């Protein structure tokens, strides 16, 4: 729907109206739990985003969540970087929804974050 684009292209502030929405964008976790999100846009980029590698590193209790449609090399390096710090990660490989969301850094509890996206041109350009 409309309201979904909307909520992607400015960002995804806030939650969505039901859980297995916010589950079936952000590759089974709820809004709540985002630290971080980048679009399958943004992982393609060359160089891996310092912003991800920021959050993996100040992380306690987080998992780095990948989208199971993209090729081992264009997340590799999320891969990492999260063993750097002792990041777990999961490819989720069960999608029902195609989601435009590469790479989910989840929290195992709430964390209630308002900013969980990297504004950039990339950003604009793929998420939709």
């Given at each position: 729907e409309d309201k979904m684009d909307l909520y992607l292209q400015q960002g995804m502030y806030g939650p969505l109206e039901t859980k297995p929405d916010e589950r079936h964008l952000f590759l089974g976790s709820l809004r709540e739990r985002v630290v971080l999100a980048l679009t399958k846009g943004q992982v393609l980029r060359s160089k891996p985003y310092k912003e991800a590698e920021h959050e993996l590193k100040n992380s306690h209790n987080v998992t780095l969540l990948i989208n199971?449609?993209?090729?081992?090399q264009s997340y590799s390096s999320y891969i990492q970087m999260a063993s750097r710090y002792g990041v777990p990660f999961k490819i989720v490989s069960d999608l029902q929804f195609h989601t435009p969301l590469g790479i989910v850094i989840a929290?195992?509890?709430?964390?209630?974050?308002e900013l969980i996206y990297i504004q950039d041109d990339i950003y604009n350009r793929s998420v939709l």
């Open positions: 199971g449609e993209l090729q081992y929290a195992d509890i709430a964390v209630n974050r």
